[PDB]
Design a protein around this ligand. Structure first.
Ligand SMILES: Cc1ncc(COP(=O)(O)O)c(CNc2co[nH]c2=O)c1O
Ligand SMILES: Cc1ncc(COP(=O)(O)O)c(CNc2co[nH]c2=O)c1O
Lengths: 413, 413
């Protein structure tokens, strides 16, 4: 099994105090921390072999090109795509989903067509579709949720019709922890003549992804949530769909011939990568994938199952706390204390060294569905332990007691 | 003055050999090398204060947010913009120019309108306009060049008309070294009712930029050419134009309210930054700007003037070599040897440790204007010396002699 002491030794940032208390970082659904292997990969790139790529002209240029395209093959293997032509490097999940909405949706929707999403989506997998349907005169529809914040395949079958052209859905929700039944939803979409676009930002860092098992048409993910550098992501798309989509950005590197008025494009995947690419960040994401693969995604998923079952049990020990979403879940808990605003919960916890996030988590329609204005969220990854969950629940108990005390004191004035 | 020995000590990558010879890196117009101050800024971020930004919830989150928005203010001051609302972080110059073509051009062009560019443009400042004019039924026109590869203001006045809505032009050409008269061209555009979009990728690393003197409406630049990390750039636009342009990408972070079907946007600049941003890379670009400012952009420009006047003189000592572009120029020389393909020149030079680039330099219409299929380019920056120019011209002389020798030997068979 994975040894959590040995894993934590690899993350320099965990070893410090905040406000006089050891840091307890429980905000990896907002962004993850990085191991030495990734930070030293960036250092070795800038100290030894930085150059621009795809010249084949000089020695450092060749080294940088081999590093960048090597990282593309690491991503391909990591999500079990069939080809490097299906792996496009982007700035992040949000840009990957925008590319699909601009190049696929805006080119393939007409009045009467539908895009189907769900109430639990993150804004990155809502607003691009709102705009693409507005641009095309198509219709946006929402799959409803069950009362525990899961999706039933009967509701999917009801909402998706033979006029649906695109179903877009998260693999795992960054608020509910729900793992959605994507392989079954891809069957339903395809049976109705639609493609499925999967927002993989919260699944890819935490569980194995196999796009040939899922059969998703597009899948998007972000490096900064999976121990890799900021500023980089991937869009996977089945090669036959990418071949027919036009580029979302235009420039150098993605062309073959440029005349005064007309140009032709390079083959995939470079068609979709305009400009000097994100060279160091993509090589660092390759290092993150080597790091996670050496531990094992199934080992990390098993650890997070342990931490989430422990947290849900310990949260049920607290009076006056509501947890949103299903019992079977990814490694996060979003909650509120009955009489304390979640921002004040996050502030008090940060004074005890503990980092969580409060707000809408970029899911305003979901907060409205939950009937709340904001929530607090503790989210876990491979470097967190049950002792840190103990600290969190002990701090929530003291938070409850503190706010009730100030209430009672103020009661006289 | 700047001491080049002390400056070179700050760039670890320069201190190595390639093919048994000290590296001589003369390819900074393709990408620049980074000083310790920038690489250690990225290390300190990932080792100490990485977190997602714009929560205001927990201590590391606040540190990362202060670093990211602090770097925005460093960029503002660095190009003398009036406000941080005018500084948008992007993935690079190519994406910045694409944002203008998508959000400004596609929204403001109609049949009969013109976009005016020049024959010397890089593809990143050609293809987006080709696509925007195609999408809108507008017209693309080209300002012609003088025979030394400069632009005359009379040709600008002739080509720009009262139907012109956008003039897009490079500040400095990455092939000719020409510095274009942007402040005068911005007057001409504005006199005709157009905006001017300036491609600053090759000017910003090498000379002071003052967008209030230039009066450009939009200005785009790339971190990786100015000692900063890969994957980041900036788009500057005058605040009154950005206020009226819609976003180019949609998602979390750039919204204020999201309903099921409609959303509203945040104020500038965050309106144009969808998704988790390029946090480490933007903080590293802030470090690059602090590094360059401590040396002085005018000092770096004076050094490069020295190196370019030295190189042009030493190239004129070589028989059988053609240099393209004007005598008064930025710090690069693009050339060809009369009877040797530029790819073979670059290969031979790399065997002597010397890195240059051969090909079309993402300027195919310019190569056609020059009547060549490809060229070789040696480009300079603050860490290069006249001794490295001596090495280059000595290697070109030996290249000439080598290819003539193989020619003569093969002459019998
Ligand atoms: C499910 C999901 N979709 C899309 C995104 C957008 O990814 P980005 O482009 O890398 O920002 C995120 C990141 N969500 C969060 C980022 O900070 N707290 C979060 O919950 C997400 O978790
Ligand atoms: C004048 C100019 N415009 C735009 C670009 C595109 O900038 P990017 O988006 O950062 O790639 C470059 C980079 N030009 C070169 C990149 O490699 N050799 C070059 O000459 C350029 O020099």
């Amino acid at each position: 099994h994975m040894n959590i002491t040995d894993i934590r030794e690899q993350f320099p940032i965990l070893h410090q105090q905040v406000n006089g208390h050891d840091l307890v970082y429980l905000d990896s659904a907002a962004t993850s921390q990085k191991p030495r292997a990734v930070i030293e990969t960036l250092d070795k790139y800038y100290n030894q072999y930085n150059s621009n790529v795809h010249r084949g002209v000089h020695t450092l240029g060749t080294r940088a090109t081999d590093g960048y395209e090597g990282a593309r093959e690491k991503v391909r293997k990591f999500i079990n795509a069939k080809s490097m032509a299906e792996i496009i490097f982007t700035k992040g999940t949000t840009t990957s989903l925008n590319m699909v909405a601009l190049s696929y949706a805006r080119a393939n929707l007409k009045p009467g067509d539908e895009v189907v999403i769900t109430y639990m989506e993150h804004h990155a997998n809502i607003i691009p579709w709102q705009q693409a349907v507005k641009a095309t005169g198509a219709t946006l529809k929402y799959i409803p949720l069950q009362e525990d914040g899961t999706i039933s395949l009967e509701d999917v079958r009801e909402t998706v019709t033979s006029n649906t052209k695109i179903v877009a859905v998260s693999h795992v929700s960054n608020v509910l922890g729900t793992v959605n039944p994507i392989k079954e939803m891809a069957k339903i979409a395809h049976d109705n003549g639609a493609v499925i676009v999967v927002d993989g930002a919260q699944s890819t860092p935490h569980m194995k992804i196999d796009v040939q098992d899922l059969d998703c048409d597009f899948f998007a993910l972000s490096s900064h949530k999976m121990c890799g550098p900021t500023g980089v992501g991937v869009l996977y798309g089945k090669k036959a769909l990418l071949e027919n989509m036009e580029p979302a950005e235009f420039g150098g590197e993605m062309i073959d011939f440029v005349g005064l008025y007309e140009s032709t494009w390079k083959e995939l995947p470079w068609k979709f990568e305009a400009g000097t690419p994100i060279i160091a960040g993509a090589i660092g994401l390759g290092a993150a994938i080597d790091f996670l693969e050496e531990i094992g995604l199934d080992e990390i998923s098993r650890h997070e199952h342990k931490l989430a079952a422990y947290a849900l049990e310990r949260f049920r020990q607290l009076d006056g706390v509501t947890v949103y979403g299903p019992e079977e879940r990814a490694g996060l808990v979003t909650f509120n204390l009955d009489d304390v605003h979640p921002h004040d919960v996050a502030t008090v916890l940060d004074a005890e060294g503990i980092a969580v996030r409060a707000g809408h988590h970029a899911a305003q329609p979901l907060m409205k569905w939950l009937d709340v204005t904001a929530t607090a969220r503790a989210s876990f990854y491979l470097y967190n332990t049950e002792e840190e969950i103990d600290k969190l629940v002990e701090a929530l108990q003291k938070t409850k007691e503190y706010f009730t005390n100030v209430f009672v004191d103020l009661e006289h004035h």
